[PDB]
Amino acid sequence: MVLSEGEWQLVLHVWAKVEADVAGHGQDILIRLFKSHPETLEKFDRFKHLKTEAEMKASEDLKKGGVTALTALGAILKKKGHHEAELKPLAQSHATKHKIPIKYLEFISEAIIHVLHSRHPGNFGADAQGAMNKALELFRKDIAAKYKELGYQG
């Protein structure tokens, strides 16, 4: 499932807007994830104490975690599919230490799409959302294959 250059440019043009304020986008995305799928919060200990959206917005550690995850994702997207080196350590840490199933990567992909659709209607019309979906599907397919190589069914 190879993206075209035109699809990559749609992905990168909306990501350029995320990069005006990665911290604020990360807060919105993690909060959307945790509200839509509370098991992703309650099962991981780093944030399991956060009870409300107000607590989530006030959490400096949640903000930092969102910046870390979105910056890693941006580096993957900028490789335009040539992301084998970037996926290796990420797959290992997410398949061995604290196991993050593919289902949860699907949930955060939905949260990314939801927040980009809300914040960026000027760069996230239907074609751009389809391109981002393709990019996130490729990411998940390749990390799922690495999970299996590493001994984790995902």
From Swiss-Prot:
Domain Globin: 2-148
Keywords (A to Z) from UniProt: Cytoplasm, Heme, Iron, Metal-binding, Muscle protein, Oxidoreductase, Oxygen transport, Phosphoprotein, Transport
Subunit structure: Monomeric.
SUPFAM superfamilies noted in UniProt: Globin-like
One GO cellular component term noted in the UniProt record for this chain: sarcoplasm
Function noted in UniProt: Monomeric heme protein which primary function is to store oxygen and facilitate its diffusion within muscle tissues. Reversibly binds oxygen through a pentacoordinated heme iron and enables its timely and efficient release as needed during periods of heightened demand. Depending on the oxidative conditions of tissues and cells, and in addition to its ability to bind oxygen, it also has a nitrite reductase activity whereby it regulates the production of bioactive nitric oxide.
Keyword Transport: yes
Catalytic activity field: Fe(III)-heme b-[protein] + nitric oxide + H2O = Fe(II)-heme b-[protein] + nitrite + 2 H(+); H2O2 + AH2 = A + 2 H2O
Location of the protein in the cell: Cytoplasm, Sarcoplasm
Binding residue positions for nitrite: 65
Entry keyword annotation includes Oxidoreductase: yes
Modified residues (Phosphoserine): 4
Origin superkingdom: Eukaryota
Organism: Physeter macrocephalus
Family statement drawn from the similarity comment of this UniProt entry: Belongs to the globin family.
Pfam families linked: Globin
Gene3D superfamilies: 6.10.140.2100, 6.10.140.2110
Lineage: Eukaryota, Metazoa, Chordata, Craniata, Vertebrata
MF GO annotations: heme binding; metal ion binding; nitrite reductase activity; oxygen binding; oxygen carrier activity; peroxidase activity
Binding site for O2: 65
InterPro entries: Globin (IPR000971), Globin-like_sf (IPR009050), Myoglobin (IPR002335)
EC number: 1.7.-.-, 1.11.1.-
Annotated residues for binding of heme b: 94
Major enzyme class: oxidoreductase
Protein's UniProt name: Myoglobin
